[PDB]
């Protein structure tokens, strides 16, 4: 316990002094103790935009740089909204193209909260009005903060951070309001910065308005360094000094290059296009006569470019046994692309879904590229490195790739689809080769996603001369923040990521797999160790494919009664069933080439039922030609599963499906011509289409099958009677 002479020692430690430095040295040291609390980043940015820090004495209107101010600008309202005059006040900041910070010096900045609070308010007003208004900030993130503040239950944040004009605004805050009232948003950001910096009021700003506290805390931790580097991006000499340091560091690996390495890098840049005479001379037989007479614009297996290439090959010289030659000649005209092979395989370059020596040439060239990419990044010439990428949305998803951008003006982002995008985009896995940039270049018209990669100390890469860099294979990326920016009046998406090893991301996916298996055995009544859901995921949009499985299976659960679910899933558990929710290509998850007969008979589409092993696939990025979302794709494949299980309940030694019986082919020729065009190809697709549309979300699509095919409705409701 403390005795009394110890209290004498504490109170003399606060009271007694030994050295007095006069006036002006303490005047100088009080000002630096004032400016020590501010992050150094905004001082460096105020240094870079052309600002001067003037610690003066006496009056502040008597300084030279504030001489030409009018009578009107000398009426200043402080942090609390009350009146002041500039010959009475002590800090003013000059606006425009040459800003000036003027601070009256005194010994009252060391202990007081008020004067230091007003100084940090003026510094925050500089930050909101000058630095951030050169990269078009504040923006939609801070508008979400503002609408969270003014739609609260309690009315203390509105009193603390808003003026009277922002109170009486009856609706919410749109981006029009940030356009034509940007100075009010600047005042609000300044006031939040002021209450966050001064360490007496930090707990008060946490208590009265917590969301502004979270915003400013995450801002002063990460976004201020990111914004300083993006402000240096607007300047050219910083770009070329970063260019200089990267070229000097990566000089010796470009000095240790051979001709074969440069040829491999250039063949990794562009696809090796196929030539046409080597295609035509390859046949020379009856095969030329099968290529010569053919319905070009009738078969639905090849794309537009591929049918045009075959139309180009007719001038270089049918749903029957000729189209197998089309399946075989689909892979024959595809360019030698390393990126497409790495993008489609998902790490298994031994997947035998293409030709033999082409697979071997792929594998040897990929091992050559990975063996040449051996140089680490860990160096002493630089601090944190910010490497960019412009990427298309269609490389991640085709479900949101069309409705991301609004239809009225194509320079906006639709906010509902943006929140659907933002909801579960937590991480990323880079299997293919990220050809990244050193500095910023503007994007192509299809590419609104503007990545920004922060590296690792163990990043392995190689250098190119034209202003690019390439990353290696199997890199883990954990997403930090996804926000809408504006650049040159075109609204975009900015995405940050942070490099992690692959084992953490696959550990997360293993944990999520075990959790979804426990939950959907618990909801279906199945054995403890059954593996019914699995994830073979390796691509960039991994997290949303992991998270969207829950919505897919719940929507399949809600659209069908529970008895058919239980019975057909019991059949699938008996037949080694899975529900592969993957985002890699369909012939490469190894539930499908372990039962097919030919390589060119492989299938790539939305959902797929493997008849021998009783599996249901799904594809992540790709969107169906018919479907509206993936949940109808899962019901669409559960249709084929019900077809197989009904084919087993006619005879346990006979045909696999109930639609191959001739007791449904008559109904398929009677009522198979009143519904959508996808099922019209043959009987099984109409079967799955009827089973998809009978269990719709809204009941009117269920009632269309009631009105158009009533006997098929009665037959399908007799096919549920198999229990």
């Amino acid at each position: 316990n403390k005795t009394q002479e110890e209290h004498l020692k504490e109170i003399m430690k606060h009271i007694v002094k030994i050295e007095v430095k006069g006036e002006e040295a303490v005047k100088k040291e009080a000002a630096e103790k004032l400016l020590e609390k501010v992050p150094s980043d905004v001082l460096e940015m105020y240094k870079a935009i052309g600002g001067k820090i003037y610690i003066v004495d006496g009056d502040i209107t008597k300084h030279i740089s504030l001489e030409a101010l009018s009578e009107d600008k000398k009426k200043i309202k402080d942090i609390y909204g009350k009146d002041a005059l500039l010959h009475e006040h002590y800090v003013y900041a000059k606006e425009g193209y040459e800003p000036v910070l003027v601070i009256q010096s005194s010994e009252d900045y060391v202990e007081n909260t008020e004067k230091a609070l007003n100084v940090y308010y003026e510094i925050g007003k500089i930050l909101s009005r000058d630095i951030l208004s050169k990269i078009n900030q504040p923006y939609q993130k801070f508008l979400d903060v503002l609408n969270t503040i003014k739609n609260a239950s309690d009315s203390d944040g509105q009193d603390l951070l808003f003026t009277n004009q922002l109170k009486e605004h009856p609706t919410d805050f749109s981006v029009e309001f940030l356009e034509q009232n940007s100075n009010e948003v600047q005042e609000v950001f300044a006031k939040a910065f002021a209450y966050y910096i001064e360490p007496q009021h930090r707990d008060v700003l946490q208590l009265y308005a917590p969301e502004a506290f979270n915003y400013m805390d995450k801002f002063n931790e990460q976004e201020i360094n990111l914004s300083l580097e993006e402000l240096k991006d607007q300047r050219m000499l910083s770009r070329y000094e970063k260019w200089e340091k990267i070229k000097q560091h990566y000089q010796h690996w470009s000095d240790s290059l051979s001709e074969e390495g440069r040829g491999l890098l250039k063949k990794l840049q562009i696809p090796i296009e196929p030539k046409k005479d080597d295609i035509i001379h390859s046949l020379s037989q009856e095969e030329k006569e099968l290529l010569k007479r053919i319905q070009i614009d009738s078969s639905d297996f090849l794309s537009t470019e591929e049918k045009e290439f075959l139309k180009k090959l007719q001038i270089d010289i049918l749903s029957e046994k000729e189209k197998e030659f089309l399946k075989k000649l689909k892979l024959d005209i595809q360019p030698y692309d390393i990126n497409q092979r790495l993008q489609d395989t998902g790490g298994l370059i031994d997947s035998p879904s293409i030709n033999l020596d082409v697979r071997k040439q792929y594998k040897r060239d990929i091992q050559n590229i990975d063996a040449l990419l051996h140089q680490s990044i860990g160096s002493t010439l630089y601090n944190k490195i910010y490497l960019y990428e412009n990427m298309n949305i269609n490389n991640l998803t085709a479900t949101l790739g069309a409705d991301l951008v609004d239809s009225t003006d194509n320079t906006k982002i639709n906010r509902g689809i943006f929140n659907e995008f933002k909801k579960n985009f937590k991480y990323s896995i880079s299997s293919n080769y990220m050809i990244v940039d050193i500095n910023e270049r503007p994007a192509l018209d299809n590419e609104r996603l503007k990545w920004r990669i922060q590296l690792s100390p163990d990043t392995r890469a190689g250098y190119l001369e034209n202003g690019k860099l390439i990353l290696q294979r199997n890199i883990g990326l954990e997403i930090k923040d996804v926000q809408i920016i504006k650049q040159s009046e075109k609204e975009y998406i900015r995405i940050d990521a942070k490099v992690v090893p692959k084992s953490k991301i696959d550990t997360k996916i293993q944990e999520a797999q075990l959790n979804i298996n426990q939950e959907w055995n618990k909801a279906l009544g199945l054995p403890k160790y059954t593996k019914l859901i699995t994830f073979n995921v390796h691509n960039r949009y991994a997290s949303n494919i992991v998270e969207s499985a829950y919505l897919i299976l719940n929507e399949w659960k809600n659209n069908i009664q529970s008895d058919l679910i239980k019975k057909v899933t019991n059949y699938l558990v008996d037949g080694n069933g899975r529900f592969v929710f993957t985002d890699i290509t369909l012939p490469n998850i190894a539930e499908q080439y372990t039962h097919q007969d030919e390589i060119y008979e492989q299938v790539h589409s939305k959902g797929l039922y493997v008849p021998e092993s009783r599996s249901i696939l799904l594809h992540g990025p790709s969107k169906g030609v018919e479907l509206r979302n993936d949940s109808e794709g899962f019901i669409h494949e559960f249709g084929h599963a019900v077809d197989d299980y009904a084919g087993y309940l006619l005879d346990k030694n006979q045909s696999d499906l109930v639609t191959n019986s001739k007791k449904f082919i008559d109904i398929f020729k009677e009522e198979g011509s009143n519904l959508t065009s996808y099922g019209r190809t043959n009987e099984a697709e109409f079967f799955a289409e009827a089973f998809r549309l009978m269990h719709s979300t809204d009941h009117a699509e269920r009632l269309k099958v009631q009105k158009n095919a009533p006997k098929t409705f009665q037959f399908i409701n007799d096919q549920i009677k198999f229990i």
Binding site: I11, H14, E111, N112, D159, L160, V204
Partner: protein, 523 residues
């Protein structure tokens, strides 16, 4: 971290710049003063001293005053850190009964009041002199000896309770003839004496001097000359010391408030009396109320570190003045109705502060007058006239006549009219006379002590009685043309003895005409 010189629980910059206690989701939160919120809620801007564990030198700290962790009996204007909490006990005597030491006895009902002359407290008993010679009733010789007996009640007007101890009261006749000394029996009674309450409180029996129960206490006795002077002056005088006993303090581990034996009032009152500025005020119901506000003593380095206290802010935090539309006022009663009496040294200081500001009207510059410690300010009411003890004993004739403007039920049984509760105090009686048309006036209670004809009724008004000294008969109106004057006398004009010539009649008594009506249906 954050510097804390005094270890009271509040940091320094909050104590110099204003702090307040806010509650958000049922948790006490100590905040810097942010004026754009805290005026809308109605919270209060406190200020205190960075280097004192209690600013007004009273036993309760700064933090325990601003947060409510304090003894619950402490008055609400003593919760501010700048207002001192300390008890003020005087003695209230209700009636006296005089008897001969063996009817021959006297029983009168007295009206006592607290005094303040030009630190210790006292009270002055005015024995009622009207009807119901004292030596004739008692039958006393020159060789007599008298016995005195009364009923007292201890009353607290301070801002802090007193636990288990009562003071030691001396009884003074005249100037310095001590008749008796009153002490509290058994020395520890297990009682409580809250601020603005009595002991024993108004619904129990009063403490009797030498009661019917006990015998062994000292009989109060007088000689003949003391009884002569007491028949002359009708006025005793109580004096009370300042032994108040231990203090109730707070505990943080269980919230209990207990009488701590290691802390006493008699060693903390001579600090409050040395570092505060005392303001006395009687605008409530003409009883004197004393408060002490902490102020800056310029020649003492730990006393210049208190906040600066203007006289406006002192009146606001002490007595509940507020300014609705600029004019500072007390429940409608504006401050131009109030005097300012000073003692000598603070009159010198106020005159120097007014000469410095180049202003002459003190009622207009109250936000600029600074208070220093060791002052004495007396704020009285302008309407009344005060005697040697600052007690209202007189008035001007205008308000006394305007007290009797509002009539209710006039008849010949008496007068029942609505009268104000402040103007009942200064009035001591009424004189009632019959005037003919011809010019003869016949006073109907022709003695100095038949003036107690008014009597309060419990609904809240007084009923004058005409029957009371006319042999319980109504007013004889033979000819209702001529009229009856019934009018009043003030305590500074009242006679309390027979005259030196022996004149018992109502002549020589000053008077204020309040009433003359015709006699028929108007009256």
């Amino acid at each position: 971290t954050v510097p804390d010189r005094d270890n009271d629980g509040i940091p320094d910059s909050l104590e110099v710049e204003g702090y307040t206690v806010d509650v958000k989701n049922k948790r006490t939160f100590l905040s810097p003063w942010i004026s754009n919120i805290h005026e809308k809620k109605g919270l209060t801007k406190y200020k205190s001293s960075p280097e004192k564990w209690s600013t007004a030198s009273d036993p309760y700290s700064d933090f325990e005053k601003v947060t409510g962790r304090i003894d619950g009996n402490v008055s609400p204007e003593a919760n501010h850190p700048l207002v001192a909490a300390y008890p003020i006990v005087h003695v209230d005597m209700e009636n006296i009964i005089l008897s001969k030491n063996e009817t021959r006895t006297i029983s009168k009902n007295t009206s006592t009041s607290r005094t303040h002359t030009s630190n210790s407290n006292s009270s002055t008993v005015a024995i009622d002199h009207s009807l119901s010679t004292w030596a004739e009733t008692m039958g006393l010789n020159t060789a007599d000896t008298a016995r005195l007996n009364a009923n007292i009640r201890y009353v607290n007007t301070g801002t802090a309770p007193i636990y288990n101890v009562l003071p030691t009261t001396s009884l003074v006749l005249g100037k310095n003839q001590t008749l008796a000394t009153i002490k509290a029996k058994e020395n520890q009674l297990s009682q409580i004496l809250a601020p603005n309450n009595y002991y024993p409180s108004k619904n129990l029996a009063p403490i009797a001097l030498n009661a019917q129960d006990d015998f062994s206490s000292t009989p109060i006795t007088m000689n003949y000359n003391q009884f002569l002077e007491l028949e002359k002056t009708k006025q005793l005088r109580l004096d009370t010391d300042q032994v108040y006993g231990n203090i109730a303090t707070y505990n943080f581990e269980n919230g209990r408030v207990r009488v701590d034996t290691g802390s006493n009032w008699s060693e903390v009152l001579p600090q409050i009396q040395e570092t505060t500025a005392r303001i006395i005020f009687n605008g409530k119901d003409l009883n004197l109320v004393e408060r002490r506000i902490a102020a800056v003593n310029p020649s003492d380095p730990l006393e210049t570190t208190k906040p600066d206290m203007t006289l406006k802010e002192a009146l606001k935090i002490a007595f509940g003045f507020n300014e609705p539309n600029g004019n500072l006022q007390y429940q409608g009663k504006d401050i131009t109705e109030f005097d300012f009496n000073f003692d000598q040294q603070t009159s010198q200081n106020i005159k120097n502060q007014l000469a410095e500001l180049n202003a002459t009207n003190i009622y207009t510059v109250l936000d600029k007058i600074k208070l220093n410690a060791k002052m004495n300010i007396l704020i009285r009411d302008k309407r009344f006239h005060y005697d040697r003890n600052n007690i209202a004993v007189g008035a001007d004739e205008s308000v006394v006549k305007e007290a009797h403007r509002e009539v209710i039920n006039s008849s010949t049984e008496g007068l029942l009219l609505n009268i104000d509760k402040d103007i009942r105090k200064i009035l001591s009686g009424y004189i009632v006379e019959i005037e003919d048309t011809e010019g003869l006036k016949e006073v109907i209670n022709d003695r100095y002590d038949m003036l107690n004809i008014s009597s309060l009724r419990q609904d809240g008004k007084t009923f004058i009685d005409f029957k009371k000294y006319n042999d319980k008969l109504p007013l004889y109106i033979s000819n209702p043309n001529y009229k009856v004057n019934v009018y009043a006398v003030t305590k500074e004009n009242t006679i309390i003895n027979p005259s030196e010539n022996g004149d018992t009649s109502t002549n020589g008594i000053k008077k204020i005409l309040i009433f003359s009506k015709k006699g028929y249906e108007i009256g």
